[PDB]
Design a protein around this ligand. Structure first.
Ligand code: HEM
Ligand code: HEM
Ligand code: HEM
Lengths: 131, 131, 131
């Protein structure tokens, strides 16, 4: 992640956070439509699972300057996700799915440049989270 | 549908209306979770669909003193849903899941009475759509 | 926008204008300073992205007595602006910042009465552009 990509995450988050709720939710809907089989793993109120996903993305954004500093957490999150039955192949599909939704919801307002950046960021988080 | 219960819809909508977006979105996620098979029927952007869905429930509250005056829209729609491969048996499921989605997001801000009341309304608009 | 203000703008503009480049640029520089992360959003050369800023400013002055006529043009602006990744909370910066830049380069040559009149006008441009 370079400088340009850092500044990009921060600007884009100005649009995302305000609508983060909808996106989280829109995400979940699209993920359950795309791979309807994963939905069983979600055993808690979809409403409050989304507040939790968005929260980490905010965390990522608050910490985009030094992501190393995050490794400790994402690992703990990786550990917990494995308990859920989340496995490797799931990550690409969640990555693709969240983006199409952040695109979907924000439209032309989620800029090509920005999408690229988030695609890279997710990527990392994902690696890190899959020890 | 009585004037007491005609009160509660006007009342709780003022609770639903401001949250329509998240509520509409969580519904589709819950739904695609509960009855996974039916997601394949929804072939349009979930975002825009939820927008379409809430607009109608608006129209519904907007006309709750005289619903007989909507039997024509409520049937133009009945025929289009038929054209969408919706069948009668879907309405109980959706309704059920809709109402449990309005309670999820609004919590203790959506009373057993508001639930009971909407329960009927959906109940009605459906039987008119199933013509 | 009372008759006084309409005149106050025409005047200060007779002063901004001869120095329109110098100012245009000072502004970006002071912008990037006040806000380290906005630079990314600017993908064209600053030397010319600034020519465009000072053009619309001219257009505004060049139309002051009638902004109703300018509401079209401006709506398109804000439209393409939203797709640059620019979100509402930027405009205050860009505002505060621009004035402070015009004032920086003119010093005393820019009346306190004119500075107020530019705030209003910039203000009005925001509303109309921010939809
Ligand atoms: C970087 C990517 C991800 C982030 C930031 C994230 C975020 C979260 C968070 C914060 C939790 C809260 C529970 C906890 O404290 O561990 C959670 C739980 C969960 N996540 Fe993720 N997640 C990600 C990737 C995935 C993937 C790829 C899947 C696979 C479908 C997934 C599915 C789940 C499931 C099934 C739960 C448990 C649901 C329950 O509470 O029953 N997540 N996720
Ligand atoms: C009273 C209850 C319902 C209401 C108010 C409602 C609302 C709507 C609305 C407003 C549209 C707009 C598109 C149009 O018809 O012009 C629509 C289409 C549609 N509805 Fe419903 N709906 C209801 C029940 C159901 C049920 C039970 C199903 C079956 C699961 C369903 C599935 C669909 C589908 C699949 C479409 C087309 C989706 C697409 O765009 O591809 N709806 N509905
Ligand atoms: C009333 C205030 C503003 C005016 C009159 C204005 C004027 C312009 C004009 C004329 C353009 C040329 C692009 C086009 O014609 O579509 C432009 C582009 C642009 N403006 Fe503004 N602008 C204003 C406020 C802002 C604000 C608040 C931002 C936030 C950073 C901003 C950032 C940008 C960016 C990033 C571009 C495109 C740069 C590129 O990629 O080439 N502007 N602006």
């Amino acid at each position: 992640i370079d400088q340009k990509e850092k500044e990009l995450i921060k600007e884009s988050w100005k649009r995302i956070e305000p609508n983060k709720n909808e996106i989280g939710l829109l995400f979940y809907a699209n993920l359950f439509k795309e791979e309807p089989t994963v939905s069983v793993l979600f055993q808690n109120p979809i409403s409050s699972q989304s507040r939790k996903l968005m929260q980490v993305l905010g965390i990522l954004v608050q910490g985009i300057d030094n992501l190393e500093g995050l490794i400790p957490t994402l690992q703990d999150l990786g550990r917990r996700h494995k308990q859920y039955g989340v496995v490797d192949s799931h990550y690409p599909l969640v990555g693709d799915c969240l983006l199409k939704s952040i695109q979907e919801y924000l439209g032309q307002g989620f800029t090509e440049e920005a999408k690229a950046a988030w695609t890279k960021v997710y990527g990392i988080a994902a690696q890190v989270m899959t020890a």
